[PDB]
Amino acid sequence: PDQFRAIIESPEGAGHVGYQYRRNTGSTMRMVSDVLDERVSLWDFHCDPSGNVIQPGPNVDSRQYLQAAIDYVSSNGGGTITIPAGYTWYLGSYGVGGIAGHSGIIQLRSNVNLNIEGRIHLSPFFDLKPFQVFVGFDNGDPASSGNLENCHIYGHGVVDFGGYEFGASSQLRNGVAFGRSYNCSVTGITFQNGDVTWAITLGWNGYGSNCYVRKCRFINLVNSSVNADHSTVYVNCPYSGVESCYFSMSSSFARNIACSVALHQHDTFYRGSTVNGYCRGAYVVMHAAEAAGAGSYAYNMQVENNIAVIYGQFVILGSDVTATVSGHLNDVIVSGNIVSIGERAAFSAPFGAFIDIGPDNSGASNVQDIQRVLVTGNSFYAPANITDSAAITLRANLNGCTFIANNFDCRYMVYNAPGTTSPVVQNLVWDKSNVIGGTHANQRAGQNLFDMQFASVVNSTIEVQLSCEDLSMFSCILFPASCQLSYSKITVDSAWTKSMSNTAVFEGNQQAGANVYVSYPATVNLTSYNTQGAVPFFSTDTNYAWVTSAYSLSINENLDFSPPATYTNKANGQLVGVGYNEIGGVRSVSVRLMLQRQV
Amino acid sequence: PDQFRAIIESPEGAGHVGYQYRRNTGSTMRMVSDVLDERVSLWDFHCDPSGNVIQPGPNVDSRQYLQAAIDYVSSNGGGTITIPAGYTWYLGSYGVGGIAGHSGIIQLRSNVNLNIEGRIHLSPFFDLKPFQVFVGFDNGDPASSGNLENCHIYGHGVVDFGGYEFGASSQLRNGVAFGRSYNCSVTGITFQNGDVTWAITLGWNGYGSNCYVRKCRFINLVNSSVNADHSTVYVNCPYSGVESCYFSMSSSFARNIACSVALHQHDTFYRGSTVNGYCRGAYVVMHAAEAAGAGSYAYNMQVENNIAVIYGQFVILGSDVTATVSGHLNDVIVSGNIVSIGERAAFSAPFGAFIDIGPDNSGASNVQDIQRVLVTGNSFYAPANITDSAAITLRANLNGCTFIANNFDCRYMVYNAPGTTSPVVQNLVWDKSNVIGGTHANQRAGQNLFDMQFASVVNSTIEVQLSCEDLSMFSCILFPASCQLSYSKITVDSAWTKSMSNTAVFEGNQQAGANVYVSYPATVNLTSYNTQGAVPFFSTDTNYAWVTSAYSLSINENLDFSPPATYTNKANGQLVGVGYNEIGGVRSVSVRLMLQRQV
Amino acid sequence: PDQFRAIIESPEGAGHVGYQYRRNTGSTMRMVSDVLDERVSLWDFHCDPSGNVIQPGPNVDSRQYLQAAIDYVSSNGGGTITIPAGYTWYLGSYGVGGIAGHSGIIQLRSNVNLNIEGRIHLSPFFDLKPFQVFVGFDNGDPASSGNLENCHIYGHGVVDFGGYEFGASSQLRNGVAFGRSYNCSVTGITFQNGDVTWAITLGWNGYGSNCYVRKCRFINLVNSSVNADHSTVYVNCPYSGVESCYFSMSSSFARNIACSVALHQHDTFYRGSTVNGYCRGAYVVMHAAEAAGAGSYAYNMQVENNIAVIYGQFVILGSDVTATVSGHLNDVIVSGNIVSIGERAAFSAPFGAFIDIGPDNSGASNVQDIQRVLVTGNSFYAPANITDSAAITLRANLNGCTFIANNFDCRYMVYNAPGTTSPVVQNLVWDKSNVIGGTHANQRAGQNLFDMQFASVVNSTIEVQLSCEDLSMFSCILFPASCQLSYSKITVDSAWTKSMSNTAVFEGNQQAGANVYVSYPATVNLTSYNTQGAVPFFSTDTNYAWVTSAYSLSINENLDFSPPATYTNKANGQLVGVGYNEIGGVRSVSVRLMLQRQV
Numbered sequence A, B, C: 001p002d003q004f005r006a007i008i009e010s011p012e013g014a015g016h017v018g019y020q021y022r023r024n025t026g027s028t029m030r031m032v033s034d035v036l037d038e039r040v041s042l043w044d045f046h047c048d049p050s051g052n053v054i055q056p057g058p059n060v061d062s063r064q065y066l067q068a069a070i071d072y073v074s075s076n077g078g079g080t081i082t083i084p085a086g087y088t089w090y091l092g093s094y095g096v097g098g099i100a101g102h103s104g105i106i107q108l109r110s111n112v113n114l115n116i117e118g119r120i121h122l123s124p125f126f127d128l129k130p131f132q133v134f135v136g137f138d139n140g141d142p143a144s145s146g147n148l149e150n151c152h153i154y155g156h157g158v159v160d161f162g163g164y165e166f167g168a169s170s171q172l173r174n175g176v177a178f179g180r181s182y183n184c185s186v187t188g189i190t191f192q193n194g195d196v197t198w199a200i201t202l203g204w205n206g207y208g209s210n211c212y213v214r215k216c217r218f219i220n221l222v223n224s225s226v227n228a229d230h231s232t233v234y235v236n237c238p239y240s241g242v243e244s245c246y247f248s249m250s251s252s253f254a255r256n257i258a259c260s261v262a263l264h265q266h267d268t269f270y271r272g273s274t275v276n277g278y279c280r281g282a283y284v285v286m287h288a289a290e291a292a293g294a295g296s297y298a299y300n301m302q303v304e305n306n307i308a309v310i311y312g313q314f315v316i317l318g319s320d321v322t323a324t325v326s327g328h329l330n331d332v333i334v335s336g337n338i339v340s341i342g343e344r345a346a347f348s349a350p351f352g353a354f355i356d357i358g359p360d361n362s363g364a365s366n367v368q369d370i371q372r373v374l375v376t377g378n379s380f381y382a383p384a385n386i387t388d389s390a391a392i393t394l395r396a397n398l399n400g401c402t403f404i405a406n407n408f409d410c411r412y413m414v415y416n417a418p419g420t421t422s423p424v425v426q427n428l429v430w431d432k433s434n435v436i437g438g439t440h441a442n443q444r445a446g447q448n449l450f451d452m453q454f455a456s457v458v459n460s461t462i463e464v465q466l467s468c469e470d471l472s473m474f475s476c477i478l479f480p481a482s483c484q485l486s487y488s489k490i491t492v493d494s495a496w497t498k499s500m501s502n503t504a505v506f507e508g509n510q511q512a513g514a515n516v517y518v519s520y521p522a523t524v525n526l527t528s529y530n531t532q533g534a535v536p537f538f539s540t541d542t543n544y545a546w547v548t549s550a551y552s553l554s555i556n557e558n559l560d561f562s563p564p565a566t567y568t569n570k571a572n573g574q575l576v577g578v579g580y581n582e583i584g585g586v587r588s589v590s591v592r593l594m595l596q597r598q599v
C-alpha cells in the first residue's frame, strides 16, 4: 500500500483510477487516464526537461513545445491540439529541418488540426527578419516536398505578428503556408498587427486541392514602406477558395501595395467577403510559372457577392508565358459585388478600376490569353474628383470580356492611356443594360467616356446608354485613327445627347468599314430644291457616304413645309430625303438626326 | 495515510492524482485536476452554498449560477462555458448592476463564449414583463458603457422565451443584446416561442464591429396584439451581418408588424436566408439618431440571395434627420432574391412591395437622402387578387435607384398613392431588361401600371416592355398634371400594345418638354390631298407639335395607294408625311403609329 | 482501507476522487467521474461483455458498439458522441428492427449528434449488397415512422464506402438517410470511394424541415455499369438545402448517370458549391408521388453561385401527376452559376444543356406545370465540337421561363429535337440582354440557332442579338409549319447579319398572325417607275403583305437617284416607298432592309 499511494501520486496515477461512463454497466471499464487521453493541449508538452509545466509569456519561447505536440499527435495518426484560451503563447526562434528553407517557425503535419483559442504572438527575435509562422512543406525545395493533408486550423483565437516592420523589401513573411496541401483549411482566426507578404497561402504551383479560408479576419497586415507587395490570401491550388472573410488595412502603404486575394488556379473562388483600406480586391491570373500541378489553364474562377472599399482596382485579370509554358485565363464570373474607390485625390494611388486587364510582371501586354469572362450585376462608385477611375482599364491584349447589367458610376467606362500600350481587343461586349451613373457629370472636359486607345478592336459591342446629361465630355466614344475597327457594333442612344457637339467620334473614319454596324446622333444642315409639293432635301456636307439611313430627332417649327422624316445617302456622300413644300421655295434647315449604318 | 484517503476524497483529490498524456515520457507531469480545468461547464457553478450540485428544472432559477460561471471565466481572461445537452436550464429572476437598466437577465463578458448545447427557458416570473436575456452593456446608460469584445454564443441548443405575451406595448424584449460589441457572434442557436421586440441586436448607435449571426433559426417570436413592433435581428454596428439563417412566424400579428432584419450601419449584409410569415424582409436605413459611432452615412449595404414569403414589403429604404445630424443612405445592392407576397386578401396587410422608399418614423417624406441603389437579378411574385402589390412603392423623396434585369410579377411596377405624399424623384432608372409578368393581366381596370404620383421626376428612365397583353389597364404609364417631368426618357415598346387605347399618358402634356425623350404607340387619323403620285398625308388632330418622327405600325390593306411609312410634324401640331397615290383621290385612313420625340 | 484501494481501482473509482474547478471555493464539489461524464466517445461502448476495450480494425465489427452508444445517449435526452480521430472504425453487419426495412446499418436517434473525427469504413460483408449507413426512420414503412429531430453529424472525418460495386441495378445504397427529419444536418464530412445511389437524403415525401448539408465533400461515389442512377444529395423536405460543398466523380459511368443535388420540395436551395465529373448539376422537380408532407407545389427553389463541369445538363426542371395528385413547379431562380460541358465527343453523353425542361419518368411531356422561373446572370460554355449543347433544351410542356442577362456560348440557344415531343410553350422570355457567344461559329451548317420544334408558342419573346458572325448557320430562328405562333415578339438584331441568307424563318408564314410582333433583316429587289423627281419603288416579290414598315440597311452607290429610306406595303404583298430620281429612268436595285411588323 506504500506503492499504491506512490502509484497514485506518480504520473501513472490516473491510469490506476477506474471509470465507467455514467455508471452504465454496459460501458467500457476504463481508467481515468484513458478518458483524459481523448483530448490533448499545448499544456501536455509545454514543460521543462523534468516534466514540470512552464507558464507561457513574453520571456518564454513556446515553439519547441508546440512542435513536440504536433510531432507526437502526428505519430498517432492525427487529432486536434488545443492552444488554450486565456493565455498568450509567444514564438521566439526558427524551426529546423525542411521548414528552414522557408524561414519557418512551426511545421504542420497531416491529420493534425490546431484549435487556436488563445493568442499566438511573435517575439521581438523576429523584428526586421523573414518568417513563415506555420509551414506545411516538409523540404526546403517545394518540388521535393511531400504533401500536407487533412490539416485544419480553427477557433476563436488570434495570430499576432508583433507589429514588426520588414527589414528589407526582398524578405518574405507569411502566417500559414499549407504547402502542397490537400483538404486543409483556416476558419475563424484573426490575423493581425503585422508587415507581411501574405497571411495565408494555399497550395504550391497547382499542387493541392480543397483548401479553404472561411470566417477569418485580417487586420492591419501592412505597415511600412519597406514592404514590397502584399496579397492577404494566395490561392495556388484548384478546387479552393475564400468565403465570408473580413479584410482591413489602415496604413497608407496598403493603399498602394495590398491586395486581398489572389486566385491563381482553376475552380477557385472569392465570395461573401468585406474589404476596406486595400489597393486591390482580387487578382485572377494564370502564371505559366505556376502551371506544374494543375495545368496551364485558370478556368472556373468566381468573384461574387463581396463588399469593398479599395484605392486601386477591384479585379485584375492576367495570363502570361514562360519559355516553355503558355498560361490561359477563361471562364470567369464577377457578379453581385458592391465596390467603391475610397476618398482620395486623383492620381494618388494606382488607377482606379472595377476590372483591370493588366500586363505581365515585366510589363508586357502582348502575351495574354484572357477570354470568356462575364461581369454582371455589380455596382461600382468612385467620387467625382477621381479622374483616374474606370469601369475597365484595358491595358493588355484581351480575347474577350462581357459586361451585362452592371451599374458603373465613375469617370470612364472603357479606358486605356494614350501613348502607352496598344492592346489588341477581341470580343469586348458592353451591353445596353449597363447603367452609366452621373456622379462625374460636368467633370469630363477634354475626356472621352469610352476612350478606345487600342491597336484594334474586332468582334466587339459597345451600346452606350446615358441616364443623365454630361455636356462637359468631349465625346461618348472615340476611336483614334491608329485603332482599326472591324466586325463590330457601336451605338449611342440619343437620350440626354441633344446638346452634345460630338457623340461618337471615329478619327480614322473607321465607321465606314464593310462590317461596322453603328448608329449615333449628329446635327446636319440641309437645303431643298424650290419645287412645290414633294421635294428633295440634301445635306450641304458630303461626309455621309457610309450612312445607310437617318431619321429626324428634331421638331419642325414650320407650317409651309416639312423636311424629310427619313434620309438615305448618295454616292457623293450627301444625305437625301423627300420632304414636302406646301408652298414652293428653297428651304434651309439644321436638324438633329440619328445616323445609322447597317442597323 | 489517513490524510491521503481524506485528501483523495476531498475537493483537492484530483489535484493529487498524477497524469502524463498517453504515458509519453516527454509530456508534462500533470495532475488530473489540471486536465479537467481545461474545460468548464455550468455544472461547475450550479451548486448550493455548501458546494452540492443542484439539478436544473422549472422550480430552479439557474441565473445566479450562470452569472457566477461567466464572472469567474472572465477573471481568467476568457474561455468557453458549456451549457450541457440533455437538460433545460430555467431563468427566473433579473440580473443586477449595469444590466438592470436594460431589464437584463445575464451579463455577457469579453472573451467568454457560451456553448449552448442544452435548452435555456424563461420561467413564468417573466410573464407580462420586459426582459433582455443576455446583455453585453455594463452600464444602464449605453453611452457610459464599456465594450463587449470577443464573445461568441454557439451550439446546437435552444433559447425558449416561454410563450409569454407582452404586458404592455411600451415594453421591450430581446434575446441577445451584444451592446457596444466588437467581434461577437451567434451561430447555430434556435430562438423560439415568444413575443419579443428583437431576438438579437448587434452594436449600439454605430459602436461595434465584426458582429455576425450565422446558421440560426428564429421561430414564432411574435404572438400577441400587444407587441408594438418586431425586427428579429437589428444590426447597429458596421462590418457586421446576417447569413444563412431561417426565420419563421405563424401568428397573424407577425404579418402586420414583424421584419426579419434591420441593417442600420455601413458595410452590413443580409445573405442566403429564408423567411416565412413575416410582414417585412429587411429595413436598410440610416437614422440620424444612430449616427454616433460610425458616422451619418449607411453605405455598402447588401441584401443578396434570400428566399422570402412576406405579407408587406421585402426591402425598405430610409434615411432621416435630427436637429443636428443628417442621415444618408447610398451604395446599396439588392440582388439574387426570390420573394413573394403570401396568399392574402387585397389590403389585408401593409401594401405589398419588393422595394419601399418609406417615410421617416414621423411620416415625413421630405428628409430623405437615398441614392446609388442597384436592384438587379431578383424575382418578385404576388398573387393576382393582391391589388396592393408593387415592384416599388415610392413614397418619399428619392435621389436615385436603379433597376436592371429583374422579373416583377405583381399589380403595379411603380406606385405611389394619389392624394398622399408627393415625392421629389431623381435618378430613377428602370431598364428595358426588367421583365413585367402576366399574373395580374385582366385585373387592372382603372389602373396605371406605372402610376407616377410624384411632385416631380428628373433624370429618370422608364423603359416599359410588356411580355403579354393586358387590355384591362388604363395605361402603361401615367403622369398626372401635378408631376413635373424633365431631363428624362420614357418609352413604351409596341409589343402586346396594338389594342391599347392609351399607352403613355401625360395629363399635363409634359412629354413636350425640351429635354424629354419619349416614344409610345398611338392611333392617328390621316387624310391626304387628291394628287396622283407622291402625295402628302396629314393628321386630322393637331396635338403632335412635340413629335420629332413617327412610323407605321399598321399594314396597308389598299392596292391603289399607300400612306407614308414615316412622318414628321408641322407648326400647327399636325403630323405630315409623303405617301403615294397610284390613282388620284383624297384618302382617309386610321393608322397605328410609333410616336417619337428626340429618340 | 482495503476497500478504499479496491474502490479506487474499481470502475467506481473516479466517483470517489474529489474535484473542484480551478480550486475555486465557490465552485461545485464534484467527483472526477462527474466531469468525465460531460463527454462521451465510442470508446465508452466499444468493449467486450466483460467490459474490456476492443481495438477497432478490419477484423472488428464496430456496429453494435456504436448503436449501443447512440441508444444510451438518447436515453439521457441527447448529446454528442465522438468517433475518435486516429482510428478507422469498420462496420460489418446490418442493424435490426425498424431500420432493417431500409437495409440500415446504424439507427440515428433524436438529439444525438455524431462528431466524426476518425474514419468509418464498410467491411467486405457489404460487397455486392444494398445498404444505408445511417438511418433516421424508426420503422420499415416510412409512412409509419416517427420523426428524427435535432440530429447533427459533423467533423473532420470520413465515411468510406469501401469501393464495392453494386450487385444488382435494383439495389439501393445511401450514406445518411435522415428520414422524417427536423433540424438535422451534415457538416464537414468527406464521403468517398463507393458505388451508391445517394450519399445523403433529407426528409421523406415532404415530411421534415430545416435540414442542411454544408462544407461536405463527395468524392468518387459511382464506379460501375450496374449502378442504375445517382443523386448525391436528395432534398425531400422544405426549408432545407445544400451549401458550400464539393462534388467530384472520375468514372465514365458518372458522366451518364450522376447528378449532384435533387431539390424536390419548396423553400430549398443549392448554393456556393463546386461540381466536377457529373452528368447533371441539379434536378428541381415536384413529383406528385412525393407531395404528402408539404403540399403539391415546389416553389421558392434557388440554384445560385455554383461552379460546375458536367457532361449532360446543369439544371433540370420537372413536374408530374399521379392518379390523384398534380405536381406544380413555380417561383424558381437560377443565378450566378458558372457552368461548362467538359471535354467530350458530340453525342457521347446526355444532350448538353444549361436548362432542361424534361419529361416525366415515363417520358410524358404533357403533364408538366412549370412557370415563373428566372434564369439570370449565369455563364455557360461548351466546346466547339459539342453539337449537342444548348442554353435550353425545351422537351416538355412549359408554362413559363424567363432568361435575362446570361452569357451562353454553345451550339444552340433554344433546342428541341424534331420528330420527338411537341411541347406546348407559353411565356418563354429571352431578353435581348442575353449574350450569345462565338465558340461555335462556323460549326452550324444546316442548323438553326433557335430551333423552335414545338407544337405551339404563345406569349413568348425571343430577342436575338449576335455578337460575332456565323454564316454557317441556316438561320437565327426557325419555326416549322407545325408550330403555331401567336401573341409573341420575335426580333433579330441586324448586327453581324448582313451576309446571312436567312435570319428569321417562318415555314408556315406564322409571322403574319394578328398579334405577332417581329422584325428581321432581308434582302429585297425593287424597281421604280421612270418619273423624274419623287418616284415610287416597288418590290418585285409579293410576300410582304404582313410588313408594317421597312427601312434601308444598305448604302446607295448612285448619284442620279436614291431608293426610299423607308417602305410600307400594299394589298398585293409588295413593298412600296418614295425615292428620288434626279434624272428620270426606271431603276432596279437590291437592298438589305429591316422588315418590321407592328414594331
Ligand SMILES: CC(=O)N[C@@H]1[C@@H](O[C@H]2O[C@H](CO)[C@H](O[C@H]3O[C@H](CO[C@@H]4O[C@@H](C)[C@H](O)[C@@H](O)[C@H]4O)[C@@H](O)[C@H](O)[C@H]3O)[C@H](O[C@@H]3O[C@H](CO)[C@@H](O)[C@H](O)[C@H]3NC(C)=O)[C@H]2O)[C@H](O)[C@@H](CO)O[C@@H]1O
Residues within 6 Å of the ligand: A101, A102, A103, A142, A172, A177, A197, A198, A201, A203, A204, A205, A229, A230, A231, A234, A236, A262, A283, A285, A287, A289, A290, A318, A361
Ligand atoms: C505578394 C503577392 O502575392 N504578389 C502577387 C504576385 O506574386 C508574385 O510576387 C510575389 C512577391 O511576394 C511572390 O514572389 C515572391 O515569392 C516567391 C515564392 O517564394 C519562394 O517559394 C515559397 C514556396 C517558399 O516558401 C519561399 O521561401 C520562397 O523560396 C519567390 O520565388 C519570388 O522570388 C518572390 O519575389 C509570388 O510567388 C508565388 O508565391 C506563392 C505564395 O507563396 C507561391 O505559391 C508560388 O510558388 C510563387 N510563385 C512563383 C512563380 O514563384 C509571385 O508570383 C503576382 O505575380 C501579381 C500579379 O499577378 O500579383 C501580386 O502582385
Ligand SMILES: CC(=O)N[C@@H]1[C@@H](O[C@H]2O[C@H](CO)[C@H](O[C@H]3O[C@H](CO[C@@H]4O[C@@H](C)[C@H](O)[C@@H](O)[C@H]4O)[C@@H](O)[C@H](O)[C@H]3O)[C@H](O[C@@H]3O[C@H](CO)[C@@H](O)[C@H](O)[C@H]3NC(C)=O)[C@H]2O)[C@H](O)[C@@H](CO)O[C@@H]1O
Residues within 6 Å of the ligand: B101, B102, B103, B142, B172, B177, B197, B198, B201, B203, B204, B205, B229, B230, B231, B234, B236, B262, B283, B285, B287, B289, B290, B318, B361
Ligand atoms: C422593433 C424595431 O427594431 N423596429 C424598427 C424601428 O426601430 C425603432 O423602434 C424600435 C421599437 O422597438 C426601437 O425603439 C425602442 O427601443 C429604443 C432602444 O431601447 C433603449 O436603448 C437600449 C440600448 C436599451 O437596452 C433599452 O433598455 C432602452 O433603454 C428606445 O429608446 C425607444 O424608446 C423604443 O421605442 C428602436 O431603437 C433602437 O433599438 C436598437 C436595438 O436595440 C438600438 O441599438 C438603438 O440604440 C435604438 N435606437 C434609438 C434611436 O434609440 C428604434 O430605432 C425603426 O426605426 C424602423 C424604421 O426604420 O424599423 C423598425 O420599425
Ligand SMILES: CC(=O)N[C@@H]1[C@@H](O[C@H]2O[C@H](CO)[C@H](O[C@H]3O[C@H](CO[C@@H]4O[C@@H](C)[C@H](O)[C@@H](O)[C@H]4O)[C@@H](O)[C@H](O)[C@H]3O)[C@H](O[C@@H]3O[C@H](CO)[C@@H](O)[C@H](O)[C@H]3NC(C)=O)[C@H]2O)[C@H](O)[C@@H](CO)O[C@@H]1O
Residues within 6 Å of the ligand: C101, C102, C103, C142, C172, C177, C197, C198, C201, C203, C204, C205, C229, C230, C231, C234, C236, C262, C283, C285, C287, C289, C290, C318, C361
Ligand atoms: C437516384 C435518384 O435520386 N434519382 C432521381 C429520381 O428519383 C427516383 O428514382 C430513384 C432511383 O434510385 C429513387 O427511387 C428508388 O428509391 C425509392 C425509395 O426507396 C424506398 O423508400 C426509402 C424511403 C427506403 O429507405 C428504401 O428502402 C425504399 O423502400 C423506391 O421506392 C423506388 O422503387 C426506387 O427506384 C427515387 O425515390 C425517392 O427517393 C428519395 C430518397 O431516398 C425518397 O425520399 C423518396 O421517398 C423516393 N420517392 C419515391 C416516389 O418513392 C425516385 O424518386 C427522380 O425521379 C429523377 C427525375 O426527377 O431524378 C433522378 O433520376
Ligand code: NA
Residues within 6 Å of the ligand: A101, A102, A103, A140
Ligand atoms: Na525558400
Ligand code: NA
Residues within 6 Å of the ligand: A371, A372, A373, A374, A400, A401, A402, C407
Ligand atoms: Na463572356
Ligand code: NA
Residues within 6 Å of the ligand: A454, A455, A456, A482, A483, A484
Ligand atoms: Na492599329
Ligand code: NA
Residues within 6 Å of the ligand: B101, B102, B103, B140
Ligand atoms: Na434601458
Ligand code: NA
Residues within 6 Å of the ligand: A407, B371, B372, B373, B374, B400, B401, B402
Ligand atoms: Na444605381
Ligand code: NA
Residues within 6 Å of the ligand: B454, B455, B456, B482, B483, B484
Ligand atoms: Na409638382
Ligand code: NA
Residues within 6 Å of the ligand: C101, C102, C103, C140
Ligand atoms: Na425499404
Ligand code: NA
Residues within 6 Å of the ligand: B407, C371, C372, C373, C374, C400, C401, C402
Ligand atoms: Na419568370
Ligand code: NA
Residues within 6 Å of the ligand: C454, C455, C456, C482, C483, C484
Ligand atoms: Na402545332
